Design a protein around this nucleic acid. Sequence first.
RNA 1: UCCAGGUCUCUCGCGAA
RNA 2: UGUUCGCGAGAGA
RNA 3: GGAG
Length: 462
Amino acid sequence: GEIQWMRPSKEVGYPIINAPSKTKLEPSAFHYVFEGVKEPAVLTKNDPRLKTDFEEAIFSKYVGNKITEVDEYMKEAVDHYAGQLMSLDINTEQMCLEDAMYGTDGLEALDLSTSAGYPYVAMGKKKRDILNKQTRDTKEMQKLLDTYGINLPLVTYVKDELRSKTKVEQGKSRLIEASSLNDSVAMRMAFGNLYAAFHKNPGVITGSAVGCDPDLFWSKIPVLMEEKLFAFDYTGYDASLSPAWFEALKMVLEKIGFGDRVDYIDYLNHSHHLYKNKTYCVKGGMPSGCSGTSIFNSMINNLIIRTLLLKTYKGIDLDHLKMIAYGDDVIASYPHEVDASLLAQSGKDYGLTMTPADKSATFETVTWENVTFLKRFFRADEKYPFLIHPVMPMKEIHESIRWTKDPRNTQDHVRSLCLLAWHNGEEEYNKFLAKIRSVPIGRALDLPEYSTLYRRWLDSFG
RNA sequence: UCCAGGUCUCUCGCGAA
RNA sequence: UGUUCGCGAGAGA
RNA sequence: GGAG
Ligand SMILES: [Zn+2]
């Protein structure tokens, strides 16, 4: 991915966009009860904690475009991945406007609790002024569709989130592309049935986990896998993606029947962006906030891995590849061991920078002990060993409970954290409840006992 | 003074028919 | 408690 | 930055 040009919106007539300059994150009641090292992300360029140039740092992810051509390995990847998906018998018809806007089996509605993007953002127009979920009215959307059309520019924001100390100072803040309501709608008309099919089929056929519940799904995953697992991390996955990857994705879509709308894929590959007082153009790179970015990045992951396997292990039978991606996150398996270290080197050839799974400083053997997916470990229940706990390390929970964007939400926030926390075991869970209840607000919260969670967990399998 | 800050998925909580 | 809808939040990608 |  690479910035083609950049210039101040003034020279071109695009309006300036102001994000709030301060974080909505404030220390919570439990700030001092738990240890933790993350703080609010750098949002502006005046920030004291900066030890480098902000804009330089945030746009640094656009490392360039390595390849431009679909080679034979990619083409074979394509064929294999397409052939897999054809077995799902995916409905290829357009999704109707009303279903696109207001959701249907497998695809939730548009979020009226979020920005409408360009150009509505420049007129104080919100989604709530256009959509109404109680009537499923499409009349004003259809008109607004005809008026502004599609392929509008994306508004770039800085994500307001916790961030590692190192990342704060080094200014490595993450960017959001706000997709236009128009484009979200047009995308869902074109691909909603694809989205639906994937959401209903988390697993090794889609090669995706979008639509799963980790509570339940974690017990399916080890059955789905092969004997030998492999995994790794990506560095700047989305922005590192070259246009060829977008061509191969089109090919897959042509293959499974979405051929008349692959042109939308071009709009993701070749995007224009408003950031504060600048307008810039990016060729390559998946924009983070477009419609289907979860589905598409995952699909593209399934193509990358097959391609590297073919490049690295000649003649490899891909029918035995069992992998599951969620965006750039992935857990893969083959009947015979595969060396992530070798794939990472082949990856360079295709513009991808691959590092060892979970920030380990060395490429080592992925096992059921140390593998992670969606930030959670795998741990069998001591009573019923075929039941697998998704286990998020307490540390992540600890970092979360220390901040809040609105103390109004304390009860709900902390309860949500308990639902994650208890898979760590009764000893750890009761300790967590202990530290929480060590402040008076803690004692005010209605918090689930371990026993309650375990029983409800077992019961949800039936 | 307020509002602002993407796409999705899952879950919990609340309100309704 | 089942569903179906609407709202809020948290987490993950 | 958007509306009062
Ligand atoms: Zn351009």
